Design a protein around this ligand. Structure first.
Ligand SMILES: [Cl-]
Ligand SMILES: [Cl-]
Ligand code: NA
Length: 129
């Protein structure tokens, strides 16, 4: 599913991401923009042989099982393919674990490089939320 910007904001808000671990909604929408371009089916192979999955490009080294990432964990207890669904519940629940792991949203390198410190409220402008 390719979400609209405000469509995704509303779903992330409904699932409790607005100020989860202190991160406003615009931070989450900005991260999804630059991780997946709001496409739930996005996948990207990393140099370490892990893969990132879904709207927030959650990685198979720690967070989900894809059966092809040696020595990895599955701390969200889900198959990585569940992160590609049109329903973002699994991606949000797992994202809550990731942002709780110690480094906040810096876990998403694209958030750190493209969203952190920017006018992230712009990402929810116009939305009826
Ligand atoms: Cl915001
Ligand atoms: Cl933090
Ligand atoms: Na894994």
């Amino acid at each position: 599913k390719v979400f609209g910007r405000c469509e995704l904001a509303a779903a992330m808000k409904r699932h409790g991401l607005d100020n989860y671990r202190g991160y406003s909604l615009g931070n989450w929408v900005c991260a999804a923009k630059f991780e997946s371009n709001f496409n739930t089916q996005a996948t990207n192979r990393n140099t370490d042989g892990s893969t990132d999955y879904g709207i927030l490009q959650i990685n198979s080294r720690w967070w989900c099982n894809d059966g092809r990432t040696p020595g990895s964990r599955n701390l969200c207890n889900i198959p990585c393919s569940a992160l590609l669904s049109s329903d973002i519940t699994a991606s949000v629940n797992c994202a809550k674990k990731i942002v709780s792991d110690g480094n906040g949203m810096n876990a998403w390198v694209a958030w750190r490089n493209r969203c952190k410190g920017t006018d992230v409220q712009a990402w929810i402008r116009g939305c009826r939320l």
